């Protein structure tokens, strides 16, 4: 009759229950939300309370309870859960809800070895006092549950043994800002810190996981993905392999070009035994890729590229097909088949495609990426020469084979190599694009290594970021954001460490960035457009012209200030060539939107002061980043309105943004009748994008007679992609509700 329920605290143990403290906290969290029942939450959680339960479990339970009510029809549960979680996480890090003063926090963290000591060297206590005035810890309340789960899961500084969380999102943002602009002149340094801080805490700019989890800590390893090109020599094979090992030990995604390795049967190049062909080496790269992963299979990913006409093409095309002899399969690596105009024309005219080992056709591989005229001339020339080892295949059989394997595994990608070079920032004769990265968005110059420390090699890197199309009000907010996006990334280039000499060379030489968007889908829904009808073509053209124009303007502004990238002379930009001058002509037939920007002024400003960065845009996919800002991923339409993630903490649900008002406005992935709509939008985006876009093809068997996708439809889509100048083609998804 004093039947209490004793809560136990962090070794302060016993104490009576406080159901009113709890209600206040809930009540607080609910402030401003619609359709959430605090009683409902209390009911679900109080029933699992037991006599000596620790306070931490009360919080977990009330958090879970709130999160288990998230739904399409009560979407504010995400915020109620989020806020409870944020609250708990404050107490878990700081002992109170009120974050310590920035200076104090940073000092404490430097002594504990969690933050880089240079933070205190670079900024004065007065400077930290001021940054603290920029910080707004109430922005922690804008995250959705899924976001808090990601922050807590892989962004906030923590102890991964003990489980202790040491920081709050706002210190992350403020310090990422500080580190990235730490070398700025005292005159502008803190203005920049604040501007960026704002941008990233209000989700205008998104940043890669390695960056958000690390900049501010003592590491200097921030790579997401690297591109290595293998030469036809054991030395290069060795070096390529070494480089992969170093890079997967730092969690980097690998894009390997192994197209030049000579085919099986070719002559021994004085000691180098390539009698055995590519496969054996491919296997060797796969083991290198997986050298620092879990069983010898879990973690570590890579995509390997080779020309369609390589002599072992048919054996390469089925490397991930599970039904086959173990020695003739390299299953845990995706492939990128490289095609150009002539190959497709052979398909269209029902003619043959000649296979050839690169070793035997002098100048053919080079021409393949850099000059299509020349490629044609050497190709026909070598077809006729009977001295040259070769094989014929009917183009139809080859294309179907590749499309078949693309279809079943979903991981046989395409790269249109002519598009990559005729419509690129680089001069094909000096710095051609001959491969992509893991997720087929990056397109940059690479040179083969002769030894792991070869200083004349070149490895390209992923330097990324993104604009949230859902958090900007008008496209002119992109000028400010381009500034901050480009300036922070450019700083990062100098900040971080390079494991391999050839990777520093490419970064310092061309300072290449890949900035893209996220939240595209939601953006299209607020403007009442759709993917499949062609209704968003001019909007897309208006939006990607604004993204490209401002990125170039900010990079140009930056070159004026600090100088163009050392190798700016190898870009087409240097010769006064713009993305609007080399885009694929057929786009003119699917969008009339007129350029709204002074491209001619900028063309001259570029020719005269050059660019800080040789490439600025690239549209990547993005699950994590997107989730933190509650946004639809990169440019892809959502599968459905509520997406589900698994966890140790239960089921995490996240409702698409503003489902309340836009449910009928969204066009979910399987609602699109086919791919034409979307491929048109990717082509329009490709007009302005420096590198490439990770574009997917999607088929639903329900929509076809007998549930089988015709090879006709598959090829027609492939050609639709090539006709609107799509550079690459990534995943292919099959199914009708996920």
């Amino acid at each position: 009759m004093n039947q209490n329920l004793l809560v136990t605290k962090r070794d302060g143990s016993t104490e009576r229950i406080n159901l009113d403290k709890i209600h206040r906290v809930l009540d607080w969290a609910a402030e401003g939300l619609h359709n959430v029942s605090i009683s409902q939450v209390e009911l679900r959680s109080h029933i699992q309370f037991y006599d000596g339960i620790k306070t931490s479990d009360i919080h977990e339970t009330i958090i879970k309870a709130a999160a288990d009510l998230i739904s399409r029809d009560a979407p504010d549960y995400q915020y109620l859960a989020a806020r409870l979680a944020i609250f708990h996480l404050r107490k878990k890090a700081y002992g109170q809800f009120e974050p310590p003063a920035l200076y104090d926090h940073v000092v404490k963290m430097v002594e504990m070895g969690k933050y880089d000591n240079h933070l205190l060297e670079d900024y004065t206590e007065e400077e930290f006092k001021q940054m603290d005035t920029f910080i707004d810890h109430d922005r922690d309340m804008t995250f959705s549950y899924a976001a808090v789960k990601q922050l807590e899961g892989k962004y906030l500084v923590q102890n991964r043994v003990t489980g202790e969380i040491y920081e709050s999102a706002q210190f992350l943002y403020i310090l990422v800002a500080a580190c990235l602009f730490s070398n700025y002149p005292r005159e502008t340094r803190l203005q920049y810190v604040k501007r960026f801080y704002d941008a990233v805490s209000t989700f205008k700019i998104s940043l890669p996981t390695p960056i958000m989890s690390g900049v501010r800590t003592p590491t200097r390893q921030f790579s997401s993905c690297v591109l290595i090109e293998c030469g036809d020599s054991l030395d290069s094979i060795n070096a390529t392999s070494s480089a992969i090992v170093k890079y997967v030990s730092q969690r980097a995604g690998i894009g390997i070009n192994a197209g030049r390795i000579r085919a099986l049967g070719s002559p021994i190049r004085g000691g180098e035994a390539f009698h055995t062909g590519c496969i054996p080496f491919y296997k060797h790269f796969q083991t290198a890729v997986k050298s620092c992963s879990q069983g010898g299979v879990r973690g570590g990913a890579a995509t390997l590229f080779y020309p369609m006409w390589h002599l072992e093409v048919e054996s390469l095309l089925v490397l991930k097909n599970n039904r086959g002899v173990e020695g003739n399969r390299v299953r845990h690596m995706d492939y990128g088949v490289q095609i150009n105009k002539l190959m497709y024309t052979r398909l269209l005219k029902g003619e043959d495609i000649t296979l050839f080992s690169p070793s035997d056709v002098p100048g053919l591989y080079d021409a393949f990426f850099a000059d299509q005229e020349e490629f044609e001339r050497l190709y026909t020339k070598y077809e006729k020469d009977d001295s040259i080892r070769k094989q014929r295949v009917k183009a139809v059989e080859l294309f179907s084979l590749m499309m078949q394997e693309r279809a079943s595994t979903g991981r046989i990608y395409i790269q249109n190599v002519d598009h990559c070079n005729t419509h690129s920032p680089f001069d094909p004769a000096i710095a051609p694009v001959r491969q992509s990265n893991l997720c087929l968005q990056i397109a940059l110059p690479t040179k083969p290594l002769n030894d792991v420390n070869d200083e004349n090699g070149e490895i390209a890197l992923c330097t990324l970021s993104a604009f949230n199309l859902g958090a900007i009000n008008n496209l002119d907010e992109l000028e400010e954001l381009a500034i901050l996006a480009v300036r922070a990334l450019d700083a990062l280039l100098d900040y971080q460490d390079y494991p391999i000499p050839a990777a520093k060379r490419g970064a310092m030489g061309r300072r290449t960035l890949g900035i893209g968007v996220i939240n595209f889908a939601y953006y299209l829904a607020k403007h009442g457009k759709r993917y499949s009808d062609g209704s968003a073509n001019n909007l897309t053209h208006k939006t990607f012209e604004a993204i490209q124009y401002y990125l170039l303007k900010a990079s140009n502004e930056l070159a004026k200030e600090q100088g163009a990238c050392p190798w700016f002379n190898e870009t087409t930009y240097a010769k006064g060539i713009l993305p609007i001058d080399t885009y694929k002509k057929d786009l003119d037939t699917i969008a009339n939107e007129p350029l709204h920007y002074d491209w001619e002024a900028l063309r001259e400003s570029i020719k005269t002061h050059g660019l800080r960065n040789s490439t600025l845009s690239a549209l990547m996919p993005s699950e994590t980043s997107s989730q933190i800002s509650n946004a639809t991923n990169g440019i892809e339409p959502p599968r459905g309105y509520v997406s589900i993630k698994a966890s140790k903490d239960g089921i995490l649900r996240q409702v698409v943004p503003d489902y309340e008002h836009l449910h009928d406005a969204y066009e979910l992935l399987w609602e699109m009748p086919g791919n034409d709509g979307y491929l048109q939008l990717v082509g329009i985006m490709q007009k302005f994008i420096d590198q490439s876009i990770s574009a997917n093809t999607n088929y639903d068997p329900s929509r076809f007679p007998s549930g089988k996708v015709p090879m006709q439809q598959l090829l027609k889509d492939l050609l639709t992609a090539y006709k609107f100048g799509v550079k690459t083609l990534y995943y292919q998804n099959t199914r009708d509700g996920a």
Binding site: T345, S400, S706, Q712, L719
Partner: peptide, 18 residues
């Protein structure tokens, strides 16, 4: 995953413009 019908028509393709 992907179940396809491998029948292809070159005549149909023929007329396409790259």
């Amino acid at each position: 995953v992907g179940q396809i019908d491998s029948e292809v028509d070159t005549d149909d393709l023929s007329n396409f413009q790259l």
